[PDB]
Design a protein around this ligand. Structure first.
Ligand code: CL
Ligand code: CL
Ligand code: CL
Length: 163
C-alpha cells in the first residue's frame, strides 16, 4: 500500500502517467476505439489481447509487466439513467478489486462514461462519486486524469472538500 493513500488530479494524457498501472475506459469488444481507449491502444497495444469484457466489468491484461485494467462503463445512449448508473458503479467496484489483487501502490484512472459514453450529459460528479465509493477502501495512490481545464478545477475541489 501507499504510506498515506491520496487522491490527485492531473490534466494530461493518461498514456504518459507516472503510476504503477493504468485503467482504460474500454469498450466491451476490446476494440481500439476513440479518446482514452485509442491513446491506451497506441501506448500498450499488447494489452488488447483477449481484453473484451461485458459492461460493468474490468479485465486486466499485462503489457510486459505493466498492468492495463480494461474497465467497461455503460454507454448512456443505450442504457436508462437508472441501469446506466448501476453499471457505472459496478465497473468502478471491479476496478477496486483488480487494483487490490495486483498489489500496486498507485493507479492512473480516467472518469468512466464522461466522454462519448456520456449520452451528451455532464457526468463529472456522478462518475467521480462512484470512483470514490469504490476506491476509498483501497490503499493505492489514485491519480485521476482529465483533459478539460474546468474539469481539473472541479475534480481538485471535490478531492480537497474531504481533506
Ligand atoms: Cl499531455
Ligand atoms: Cl467515455
Ligand atoms: Cl475532461
Amino acid at each position: 500500500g501507499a504510506m498515506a493513500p491520496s487522491y490527485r488530479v492531473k490534466r494530461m494524457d493518461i498514456a504518459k502517467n507516472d503510476e504503477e498501472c493504468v485503467v482504460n475506459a474500454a469498450n466491451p469488444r476490446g476494440l481500439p476505439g476513440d479518446g482514452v481507449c485509442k491513446a491506451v491502444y497506441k501506448k500498450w497495444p499488447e494489452s488488447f489481447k483477449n481484453s473484451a469484457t461485458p459492461v460493468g466489468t474490468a479485465k486486466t491484461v499485462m503489457c510486459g509487466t505493466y498492468p492495463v485494467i480494461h474497465a467497461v462503463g455503460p454507454n448512456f445512449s443505450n442504457y436508462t439513467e437508472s441501469e446506466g448508473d448501476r453499471e457505472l458503479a459496478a465497473a468502478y467496484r471491479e476496478v477496486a478489486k483488480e487494483v487490490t489483487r495486483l498489489g500496486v501502490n498507485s493507479v492512473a484512472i480516467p472518469l468512466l462514461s464522461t466522454g462519448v459514453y456520456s449520452g451528451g450529459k455532464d457526468r463529472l460528479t456522478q462518475s467521480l462519486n462512484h470512483l470514490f465509493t469504490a476506491m476509498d477502501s483501497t490503499d493505492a495512490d489514485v491519480v485521476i486524469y482529465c483533459r478539460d481545464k474546468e474539469w481539473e478545477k472541479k475534480i481538485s475541489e471535490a478531492i480537497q472538500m474531504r481533506t
